[PDB]
Design a protein around this ligand. Structure first.
Ligand SMILES: [Cl-]
Ligand SMILES: [Cl-]
Ligand SMILES: [Cl-]
Ligand SMILES: [Cl-]
Lengths: 301, 303
């Protein structure tokens, strides 16, 4: 019962979001990536409810949000998310993010440096100099190579169309292949539901093509480069969750990354895939809610 | 890795468990009756990345010594004070349950500079009469009146001795009766081990007789009254964990109590008994570690 669904009309379309917690608590934005929706935060938001006003948007073209006729590039995603945030009047918020949600969060904090009260993040996107940086790890390689090959295909003209628009591979193969626990039939149903038609899957094809790999595309590479430099300069508290062996972010890399930042703690979750929320909702929700309470306590008087 | 250590304190020795890097903030874990630092074993490893975790065994509990003392609330307070001084702990987070909260509140009242934060659950407060002890509105009222009855029998001369000294009722009946999951043979054995002999059981008898109920005993009542007044005025960060239906603290009481304090978040654990660590160790360890990370980052940013 506790989580409600809402919609706001913005940029000539609608954005959906899930909402829980007291109206008067600090704002907490939960930002999903590809090809998920605010549904992926369903077991995490109730744990954070006692300390934050939890808002979990569905990105444009994802979940219950509209499907306008737009390019669905990273910058489109940023623009729709901004519009919703502004419509709701959110001027100050914690961010909790994963996948393309972290790219959105980093870019948001860069453009709006007074907004972020703290960032909780995991499995984050950064500029990758070469394909060896996509899913980089030291554990005795076969998985990492096969994810590289999937995304190489997603990024190939015609091939990517057939895999994603025709066969919905990002939702049907990549998503469950990246979570350890067995998803229920209703959980798969909820993930595939926005994506029933071929055309509706375009956003899920657009995002692996926006990944900043070998400088391509340059616009996203450059924006995420600016965003990472702002992240490194920022002073707000940060919580970085990491799984083993890590998809985009290994435990070793998390540790080294965290030293490049101010006030970042690393939380080792143990075994996981790319989408950590489905294997660790309780460890994530519990950590985040205590972290917010801490920051709010220490910040006030 | 959690290691076990000893120090000579006052007229005896004290054990404590330790884990985490020696240059992180001190985090003290305080157990109650009739447990030991063993109860924190699945919680300390989750806080270890953010804190220097020390978990004492109270005098007469766990692996601590067994001096011929009265084992009153103040003897506990004195032996814990001395271990804290011996360890040179001047600043700490406190993580506490049952008589460990009494000790915590009493500690913080006397040394207000010490406390970086207090994470607490299922805590002792002066209770005006028995209906206060285990108050809830859930229709196992049977389980509540039973608990009251148990504790009234513990406080009765001759009867408490036969229940606890002769039969070891607190270890054998109250402890597992107050945890939702079934303890393994190994787990019971670790709760039994300090209380194998009849004379060892004395600490577990004295504490229910220390419980401040209808002003008795007057002295613990007065100390814990003072301690609750200082907790209500304190400004350090607080987490209060709460279980359903509640043993000493119901979710409804935790909500009213949080309104009395500054900077206290109430964390809902769901179904649990009086001893919350055995059913919710991941939720507690994760919450505490998160809270510490947040307080340390915001305090660093500030100063
Ligand atoms: Cl996601
Ligand atoms: Cl992607
Ligand atoms: Cl305890
Ligand atoms: Cl007791």
């Amino acid at each position: 019962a506790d989580i409600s669904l809402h919609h706001r009309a913005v940029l000539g379309s609608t954005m959906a979001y899930r909402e829980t917690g007291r109206s008067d608590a600090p704002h907490v934005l939960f930002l999903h990536g590809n090809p998920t929706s605010s549904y992926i935060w369903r077991n995490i938001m109730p744990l954070v409810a006692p300390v934050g006003h939890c808002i979990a948007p569905d990105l444009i073209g994802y979940g219950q949000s509209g499907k306008p006729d737009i390019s669905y590039r990273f910058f489109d995603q940023a623009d729709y998310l901004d519009a919703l945030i502004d419509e709701l009047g959110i001027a100050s918020a914690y961010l909790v993010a994963q996948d393309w949600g972290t790219a959105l969060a980093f870019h948001l904090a860069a453009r709006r440096p007074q907004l972020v009260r703290g960032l909780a993040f995991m499995e984050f996107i950064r500029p990758m100099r070469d394909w060896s940086d996509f899913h980089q790890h030291d554990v005795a390689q076969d998985h990492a190579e096969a994810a590289r090959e999937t995304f190489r295909k997603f990024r190939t003209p015609g091939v990517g169309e057939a895999m994603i628009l025709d066969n919905n591979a990002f939702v049907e193969r990549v998503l469950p292949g990246s979570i350890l626990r067995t998803l229920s039939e209703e959980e798969m149903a909820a993930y595939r539901a926005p994506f029933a038609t071929r055309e509706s899957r375009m956003p899920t094809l657009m995002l692996p093509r926006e990944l900043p790999i070998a400088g391509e595309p340059a616009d996203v590479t450059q924006a995420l480069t600016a965003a990472h430099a702002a992240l490194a300069a920022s002073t707000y508290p940060k919580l970085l969750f990491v799984g083993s062996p890590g998809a985009l972010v290994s435990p070793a890399f998390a540790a080294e990354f965290a030293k490049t930042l101010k006030h970042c703690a690393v939380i080792q979750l143990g075994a996981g895939g790319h989408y950590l929320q489905e294997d660790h909702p309780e460890a994530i929700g519990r950590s985040v809610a205590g972290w917010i309470a801490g920051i709010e306590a220490a910040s006030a008087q």
